[model samples]
Target: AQYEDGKQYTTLEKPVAGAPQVLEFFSFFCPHAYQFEEVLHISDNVKKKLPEGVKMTKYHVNFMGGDLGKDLTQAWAVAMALGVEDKVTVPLFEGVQKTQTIRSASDIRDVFINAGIKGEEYDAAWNSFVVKSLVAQQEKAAADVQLRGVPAMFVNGKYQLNPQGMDTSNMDVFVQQYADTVKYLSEK
Candidate 1:
């Protein structure tokens, strides 16, 4: 999936054609994104969760451009290296919520290393497909998305914003609703 210049937010990595697309406008540094991570697992378990040939790319936009700018870039790099680049959607959010540096690439590896992804497995993952295109793609996503904060989501090229903001207590419900919305939209 090659990200072209001047077209970062314009389209998904792979178009669905007959099916509608699903886009998750997320950040590696948002706690809310972390809260939604569990849902990702649920989505995976929900059977054919991802639309057919429909790309569910997680745009790694950084909300902390001014404060922890460099760390944000590095975090994306590390995430890409981890192959969980897409899978880290919720984990990254969780890290930030737990006061962990979601945007710190090297430090994130420490978290991963501590989490049992160690030895040559860690080394190979670090040197594999995850980080290859991450740096460039991350920069483009951050630039184009221009996200205001963490935890925001987009469906089918549209922004769902933060539904949890309306009712914090119903976070699980909101996330499920978001997932359901994506699933529903995936069908032509």
Candidate 2:
């Protein structure tokens, strides 16, 4: 909700030419989310299966620690700074799994740098409006959602990753299911 364009959040604000689908409400710092790495091949699959004009935007949410939030926000800033927001999110997620201490923006940046993101660009983004906005938006989202986990998913503005509704161990399945559900909803 306090999401401002190009500042706090990077949203596909405009609807695409065809169906409007979105994968919102996810985290990059959760164990369950870490499990999703094995399902990355599905991203390519989704790209291939989805029809043109389908807008899919992945928004990263932080429901971890205060300092942890800063690192995540900084990495996001770096990603947006490098104009590789989407490209860096997944890799950053992977790097986060390897992090033993995620209490500061600097620590997270180290993980990001080890993952191949340039430190200079990371610092630049950290100071840019994108990072500022991203941190703001994430804090706002975390405040509003009262999130209980990191790998939650929202499809078409609806939250759907409830443990009570579905029982599964794989995050990829959950994400893939969300995408399929979005496609079906779009077709209808």
Candidate 3:
């Protein structure tokens, strides 16, 4: 399950501090990202394999352009700022990828409201300087890493992994291999 250099993953020019930073770059509008989420929920396993002190975070990419990407990115930033990602992530995903009910920022705002975030609370978080800054930071990070698509992984901020060309029939194998490689790299 070792990641082959330049094949399975590529090393970064400057490694991020706090070694073992595992980041997932994704977009809500991507079907593959939705599939990845499905796999994670089905197993509830790979995340548990993360080595101690390994910081796992997600970056919502705006590669799709237009208002869709901006809206989702802002929504995610707001959810993260409010410490309500767990409450809003799945619902937002379902709203867009499953029920197809989400199409605008207002729709995303409603999703958060349904998740129990009061209008004032959600508004404050959505418009907060912290959320704005975080969104900008994510954009800069994505650019720094040359991110091109969704469902991508950055291990220790020094390697990029993606499911492109991976066998969909063996998603579990792919997940385990990815997790194993991450664990191996984290130890180095």
Report each candidate's C-alpha RMSD, comma-separated, in the order given. Answer: 8.1, 8.7, 2.7
Model 1 C-alpha lDDT versus the unseen true structure: 0.49
> What is candidate 1's lDDT per residue for 1-188, written digit by digit as tens?
22222222233344333222444444445544554555444334322465667666554554454445445555556655665555444455556666566555565556666655675665565565655566566556544445455554444544343343333456555545445545554452
Q: How many pairs of residues collide in each model? A: 6, 2, 0
lDDT: the better of candidates 1 and 3 = 3
Each candidate's lDDT (Cα)?
0.49, 0.53, 0.74
Q: Which stretches of candidate 1 lie over 4 Å from their true place?
A: 1-20, 38-48, 65-69, 85-106, 116-132, 156-173
Check candidate 3 and list the clashing pairs.
none
Q: Return whichever of 1 and 2 wins on TM-score.
A: 2
How big is the positional error of residue 21 in model 1, measured in Å on the Cα after superposition? Answer: 3.9
> How well does candidate 1 match the true structure in TM-score terms?
0.56
Residue-by-residue lDDT tens digits, candidate 3, 13-126: 776654337777778788877777764542234467777776677778787747788878988888778889789878877888789898888888898889999999999988
Q: What local lDDT score does residue 44 receive in model 3, on the 0 to 100 scale?
A: 36
lDDT of 2 by residue, 35-134 (tens): 5434544344444556568655444565554557556755665665576755666656665666555545666777667667688866777788877876
> Over 4 Å off in model 2, which ranges?
1-20, 39-48, 85-91, 99-103, 141-148, 159-176
Ranking by lDDT: 3, 2, 1
Arranged by TM-score with the best first, the candidates are 3, 2, 1
C-alpha displacement of 27 in model 2, angstroms? 2.9
